[PDB]
Subunit: 26 residues, 4 copies
Amino acid sequence: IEELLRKIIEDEVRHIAELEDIEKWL
Amino acid sequence: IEELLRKIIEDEVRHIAELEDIEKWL
Amino acid sequence: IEELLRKIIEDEVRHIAELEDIEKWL
Amino acid sequence: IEELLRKIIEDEVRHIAELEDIEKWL
Ligand SMILES: [Zn+2]
């Protein structure tokens, strides 16, 4: 479970970058 | 942007499965 | 923790709707 | 769309805190 949560956190972190980039580009 | 949003959606979908699994196991 | 995971899942579910809507509108 | 993306980012940010807290507690 701990390693799985780590993977989910890493995804959420990538989403912050990706969504902030979309915000900038729009 | 559309392909990027698709990738983010796919991640969020995986998170639903993963978090629901953690809920079941806990 | 179980109730907190439930709240996170609910958010992720809302994101799928919101991101799919953005996909449609773009 | 820009305001909606902002709301999603805010949720993802809360998830990082919440998931990191779960990691610490587990
Ligand atoms: Zn998310």
